[model samples]
Target: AKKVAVLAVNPVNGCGLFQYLEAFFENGISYKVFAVSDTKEIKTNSGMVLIVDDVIANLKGHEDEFDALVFSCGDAVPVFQQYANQPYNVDLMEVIKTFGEKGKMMIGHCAGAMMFDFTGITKGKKVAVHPLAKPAIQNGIATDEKSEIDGNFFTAQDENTIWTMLPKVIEALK
Candidate 1:
């Protein structure tokens, strides 16, 4: 029974979130959504609002409670980039570092893939990223593949790659 931590922000991509939930549900993998914003209510690109399980702040010391980490790309790249570059992002970055150090599986979709570069965890690792996010990536070798896997890190280009990458993630989870 693997537990997962899903990180997302305002205007999350509903399509992405739904696919993640469905994948976890079918695989019997439990998950808790963490909001990077101050509020628990998150508005989605599809006009839906999500009340997540908790805030990222609460997930800091409890990293060991989850087996893997998932990042949401948001409706736009700037939405994710703004938070990742903010001052309060220190804790979130730390959590990512800890997960990487522990060899826990990490998945990032679309612009979410930039997080690996932003956190300095990719270390020249090969990754698949959204075309919009490719320019911002400085640490990883961004590939044109729809989805890619390198060691414990998994990445998908965008909504289109969800079908391809998620199956791999499930396999890795098992």
Candidate 2:
């Protein structure tokens, strides 16, 4: 059966991702985690390390393997800023767009939510961007919301909205 796939960048933030995935699992949904990092093992901002089960280098092999793609938001702002400029970041953004175009679901929270905007993936779509990033989003970029669901794309304003945003994503998946 197809499962939900959570994608993280180098230095996985397992805490938030795990929490969100757990909610889905509680409802009997299966999922897989994927990370895009320079190494197989990534340390989180909180100093926790996670051994990535799947790497972006091999993600293409797993195409069409999931029903949805979720991007995790980490605790640190600087880390997210650096990641946004990385080459892999651009590639992954495109991948998310392709998935959505193919009729698959995609969700991004906080920093991950920024990805949707920078990549122009959510133009004219209402989205929940981090409150801190609202100005950047409002400049003809990502639309505004506390937790927006526009078509197949869903987003939360910040980590605080994760729980609230998730149910909407679950509804979209259905």
Candidate 3:
């Protein structure tokens, strides 16, 4: 059985999170949700609070427990900006960088793919990002496709692409 580490943003897209969760559950792929918060609870876009497994600030050097890393949705820019300057024991940037260096499978649905742009990991790679996320991508070649896989990176345009993208993700996990 393979496991994945899922990172979600504060006020995350609940629909996106639960969709992925359902797929992971149905497929028998284990997962734990991590967020950059001191408390165990994080809010969704609709003001719903969900309890996560752990805080990402403590996830450094333990990337081997999971086969893949996932960003459940977009809207991580503000969180990224805050942590980029203030710093955490293991900031999201560092986590992504570590995962990239290890050649781990990284998946980002919606504007979540924008996280790779911050690290230049997907530069010149064909990425399928949400339309609103295009401006934030200082790097990468944006595509109109619903989903894309370039090397170990997997990106989807938005939540609607789940039926199309998740199958590929399950394949890669194997």
lDDT of each: 0.81, 0.68, 0.79
TM for candidate 3 is: 0.90
TM-score of each: 0.91, 0.81, 0.90
Clashing pairs in 2: none
Candidate 1 positional error at 131, Å: 0.6
Arrange candidates, best lDDT first.
Answer: 1, 3, 2
Pick the winner on TM-score between candidates 2 and 3.
3
Worst 10 residues of 1 by lDDT: 79-88
Q: Please write out the lDDT profile of model 1 over residues 43-114, one tens digit for every residue.
A: 887878789888888888899999999987676447544655653366667778888777788898887668
User: 1-174, model 3: which lDDT tens digit per residue?
Assistant: 888888877767878888888888888889988875565588887888788899787677788777888887745455666566644424777888787778788888887678877788887788888887788878888888898889888888988886678888887776
lDDT of 2: 0.68
Best candidate, TM-score: 1
1 against 3, candidate with superior lDDT: 1
Give the residue spans of candidate 2 off by over 4 A.
Answer: 75-87, 138-144
Over all chains combined, what TM-score does candidate 2 have? 0.81
On lDDT, the candidate that comes out on top is 1
lDDT of 2 by residue, 1-174 (tens): 447777776655566677667777777777766766555576675778877567655555465778888887765444655666565565576667666666777787776656656666666777778777776663224555667777777777766777777876766555
